[PDB]
Write a protein that binds this DNA or RNA. Sequence first.
DNA 1: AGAATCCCGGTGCCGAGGCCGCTCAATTGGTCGTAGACAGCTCTAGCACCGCTTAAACGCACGTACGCGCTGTCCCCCGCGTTTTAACCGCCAAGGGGATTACTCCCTAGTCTCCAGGCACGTGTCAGATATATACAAGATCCCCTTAC
DNA 2: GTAAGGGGATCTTGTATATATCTGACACGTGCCTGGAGACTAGGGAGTAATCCCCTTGGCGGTTAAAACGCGGGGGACAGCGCGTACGTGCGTTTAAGCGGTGCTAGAGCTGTCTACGACCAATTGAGCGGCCTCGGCACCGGGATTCT
Lengths: 104, 105, 83, 78, 334, 91, 94, 97, 100
Amino acid sequence: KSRSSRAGLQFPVGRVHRLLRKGNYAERVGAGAPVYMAAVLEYLTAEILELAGNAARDNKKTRIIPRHLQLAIRNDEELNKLLGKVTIAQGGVLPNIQAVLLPK
Amino acid sequence: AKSRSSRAGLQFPVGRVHRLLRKGNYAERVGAGAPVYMAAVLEYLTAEILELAGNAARDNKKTRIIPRHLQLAIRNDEELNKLLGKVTIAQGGVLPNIQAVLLPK
Amino acid sequence: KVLRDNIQGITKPAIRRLARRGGVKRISGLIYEETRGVLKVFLENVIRDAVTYTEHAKRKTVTAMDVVYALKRQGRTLYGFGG
Amino acid sequence: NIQGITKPAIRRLARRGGVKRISGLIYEETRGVLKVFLENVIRDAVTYTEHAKRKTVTAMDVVYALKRQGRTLYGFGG
Amino acid sequence: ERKAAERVRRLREEQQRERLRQVSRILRKAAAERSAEEGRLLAESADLVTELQGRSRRREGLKRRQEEVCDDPEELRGKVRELASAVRNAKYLVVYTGAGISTAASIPDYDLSEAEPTLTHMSITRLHEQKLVQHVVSQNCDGLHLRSGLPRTAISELHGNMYIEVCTSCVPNREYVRVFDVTERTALHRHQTGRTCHKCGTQLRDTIVHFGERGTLGQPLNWEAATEAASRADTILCLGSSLKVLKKYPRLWCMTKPPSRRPKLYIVNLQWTPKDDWAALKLHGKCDDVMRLLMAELGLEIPAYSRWQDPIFSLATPLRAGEEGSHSRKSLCR
Amino acid sequence: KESYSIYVYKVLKQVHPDTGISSKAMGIMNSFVNDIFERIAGEASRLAHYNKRSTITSREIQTAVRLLLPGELAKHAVSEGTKAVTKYTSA
Amino acid sequence: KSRKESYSIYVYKVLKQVHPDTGISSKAMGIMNSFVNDIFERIAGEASRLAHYNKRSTITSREIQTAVRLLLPGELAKHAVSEGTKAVTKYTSA
Amino acid sequence: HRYRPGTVCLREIRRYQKSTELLIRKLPFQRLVREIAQDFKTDLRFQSSAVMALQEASEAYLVGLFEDTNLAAIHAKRVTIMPKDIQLARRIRGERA
Amino acid sequence: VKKPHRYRPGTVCLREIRRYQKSTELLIRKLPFQRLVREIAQDFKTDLRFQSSAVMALQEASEAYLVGLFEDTNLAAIHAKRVTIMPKDIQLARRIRGER
DNA sequence: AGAATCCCGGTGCCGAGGCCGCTCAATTGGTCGTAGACAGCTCTAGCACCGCTTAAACGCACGTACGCGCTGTCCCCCGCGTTTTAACCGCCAAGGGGATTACTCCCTAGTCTCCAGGCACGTGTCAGATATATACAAGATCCCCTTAC
DNA sequence: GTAAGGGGATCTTGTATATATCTGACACGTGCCTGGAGACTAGGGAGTAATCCCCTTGGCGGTTAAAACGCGGGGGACAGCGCGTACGTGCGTTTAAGCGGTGCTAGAGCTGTCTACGACCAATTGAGCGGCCTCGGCACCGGGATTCT
Ligand SMILES: *CCCN[C@]1(NC)O[C@@H]2[C@H](O)[C@@H](COP(=O)(O)OP(=O)(O)OC[C@H]3O[C@@H](n4cnc5c(N)ncnc54)[C@H](O)[C@@H]3O)O[C@@H]2S1
Ligand SMILES: [Zn+2]
């Protein structure tokens, strides 16, 4: 019955429609705009969660923590470009030591 | 007096700024003193830039301001350069600057 | 007629003039290719954004307003061409 | 109170940055740059706090002030 | 600093522009063309007065050296006697030459095959055949010295010749006298006559030296005997040369010698040369008249040039058949 | 208060069934979703304003996604949005 | 064709106020128009964000003042604030 | 024995690049924050979240700056960083005119 | 040797620096730049048309970008006790700037 | 050989995932006014070609100043041990001030009428562009004079 | 007696400056029409007072690990020297950018209309939000196994 179930998405559509309607973006809001919104947001969150769960599996843990999200974002090139100006709390750094500083 | 800019003692339009504020999707309602404040601030900024541009034009023995004079005025002042830090002005050039190490000894 | 290999039209003296305006006194011999690559990347990005802007409006001509919008979208605001 | 940023702390931050050896005139420069950064961010945060007619600086004021400078931060209510 | 308090640059600029424009437009007025009221206090700006006075002084000092300076015939005939006495008392004299000597042949200074040797060249030859003159250095490229009759063993044209072709493939190197010039298609670093040799099997090259080029041949421009003669000679007689180019060769003037030990130079040229201050006695006037008067003073005769007296025709190397048509100038005939 | 904890958890159990999550990670995910929503919405609003329009359709959202997301992310997001819109309209 | 709006009439009046015997060219006019539009957009966007943060539907002069303080660096901000307050006081009193 | 100078330096690099905690004490940073803020408005108050967020942002900024500084130092054929490296990094980044 | 007047290596470089820092004109010929822009554009849409002001704006932006990049490169070159600029200077400038 | 770090076993403890109950926000249904999709016309600016005159690009030679490798020193960071200190933890009090609710005046949107300010078009004359001849300001080299030998 | 180094005069070249001629763009005037100003109505946003119970600031006693201090030694920074070659300066040659016409046609821009679509409002039911719990996932402590030095 819900407009989300009419498209298969798991994200809300009424919430997105209300946020677009009272967000001071335009005079009128189309009918299919919240469906597009929810589709794109769902794709992005699903992909990020897949990569983070992979990185959590490589560390022999059953839960995801900000370290794994940071690892997933930093390792992949596309998500690294998207979240370039973003600082993640309790993230850390990618392990990297310059070769010229390594002993011979 | 009829014009709202004359009552505020400004040279910038108040009615036009009010209409632009209303038809811009910034807020549902717009107060009565906002256009006056905005016109005053914009007038102050434009006069401040224009004075330095006119001085730089007179320094070159010319009586008409061209983009080079605007660029010189903007880049030669600290705060105006900080404000317009990521702006490119067409036909403006650069400030002359040579590093000291490159000059003959 | 299709365009092919026009990056060579940006000549070495032009790069030297740009460098002199930048304050450069001595130039190596491998700088020209690096400059050409950097310029190509920059132009690719800007023109892709401008083409997207002009295609949204169901148009067939790229306008200066689209170029200005694309530049402002990358934090490179430009004055004197409208806006 | 800037001297409460000890030298081992700067060494640890440099280690996480990948630095091997550190000169002896680095600590004062680090203190100066940190002071400038904090001054700017706190100035913007206090402005945001003053507009809302409050006396307490909340985490959202810091988040907005950071976002104004292009230093977006996640995990505090963004 | 306050923005308004930072308006001291306006007073700075005002004072600077005022003083500069005032002093410029005040001192730019000539005193002789100024009135009493505007010109009474010209000397008030002492520094300005001395600066513009020195600038103008150097200006007409530089200008005054660019015009002809001549001596009246009384002084000329007074100087020629002492010059003749000096040349008679001279032991080892070398003669330097320049563009002014050939000027009497309507040759430009700083077609050319129609020129002929002048009186000065004949006087030089007659002086040389009397042991008075031993070595001659020249900078002219016309080649009138060759046509005069002066032996090539005692001359060295340091800038080449327009009537000689050279081949370097041979171990001792080869030279050939050509009646016509080879200067038609000569440029910097492009030294190729484009003509068949005699038997070498390689194309010849010209002999002209351009600015920036370093002389390497030894046949037309001998750089050993000239230096040796300039080192051994105790007197110098330059004629018709400004010496603005020859002054760049140190060994020719023997500049390493102490100033007292340097040979005495007797310049004869109209304009002013940078060696003027060290001249033993400079003469101003046409070198042709001076040489004629020198010959009259010494009693030496006047050699006469004839168009059948050119030795170039006898020494001209015959050209390979079919190669004559390449050149596009006027040949020389007896 | 409102959040996307309920939906992100659903997507998580969809992708990795035998995995849990803490609270800080969920907060970071919420901030991510809010940031992306604001970016796309603002870009679409600008697009509508430039063309002298008054409504925000799905064309605005699609062009915003093209101008914002990089690389193959844009391709896959555009495809999923078109497919979801078609399924919603037909159903 | 349609009527087009610009700020040349006001910019020229301000220029004649400051330098009474100076001119201006067309390219400089375009640069000045772009400058005014850019500053207007910046301040209006900041004020709208400030209104949304505090859950208010109205843009008043307090929002403009706060946006001016946020966006202008120094004594520029101080002088602009004083000028705006003077203008609003004169308008309200009269 | 005595490790040759350089081993413990890399050991610490690995340790602090394989970690997530904070590298500055909390009480001194709070004290510095309050003393800086007292010059904008007297009698101010703070929440713990505000000071935590300030600390996280500052540490991230300093770590990134040190990365750029190390790159600049390596470019000059050295191993140790100097104030001129910090100045060059800050000037190229645009933080200084 | 007939030695003419000749400036030492470095004088004309500083003379050119002053000449091109006192001017405002464009330093790239227009026809090759327009050809390059169209060639790049033909990989996103076929048979496109360009306004003259669009190409002028593109040229202005590109020249400003290149001048700024060369200034940063010169600073990087000076830092390493050199006078000449080399590709690694450009790479370091772009890496610190945030590009790549 | 030998310290530093990962691997395995056993325990504890609080945080993530479910379950209950409920209340506001999304869903249904219909209605009304207007935005924009589509057809059509026009006129303007973007594309294509041609001929020419000339300045900029290009190829080449020469030499010199700069970049790079090697060596020596000396000095200033790093690793280790011992003493000094203040951060962190857990506990307990107290009042400021953020957050919610109720009520009332008044400020702003909406509408109609009317006039004047600003925009499109036209015309002239003067400030800046251009050619021409001088003046001068800096660079490059030579030669004389001074000093250690 | 000899030679290396310091400084004034000079020549050259490129840039700045004074004077006249001219041309196109800036500045001022005119017609007019569309947007801003004047007057009035109604209704909801915002300001003001009151109350509470959350949260921030302050003080106190241990303890224990982190910071500060001293010392010795070795590796890295930096100066100095020699050498080779790559890059700058200038000249002669070749090419293609820039300019001024001539012409055509796609495609941008504007006008009319007419219908489908989005905003508004009253009912009403279920999806998401606040509280409580329960039990396991991960950190902690200790012995030994591998691993660079
Ligand atoms: C190594 C480069 C070679 N360049 C060149 N060959 C291509 O070498 C010569 C030579 O370098 C130079 C000729 O110099 P010059 O012979 O001294 O002629 P200059 O211009 O300096 O004038 C001489 C002076 O003598 C005066 N003068 C003119 N007419 C006179 C008469 N009839 N009598 C006496 N003096 C006379 C002139 O006023 C002039 O000042 O160019 C080639 S190029
Ligand atoms: Zn031979």
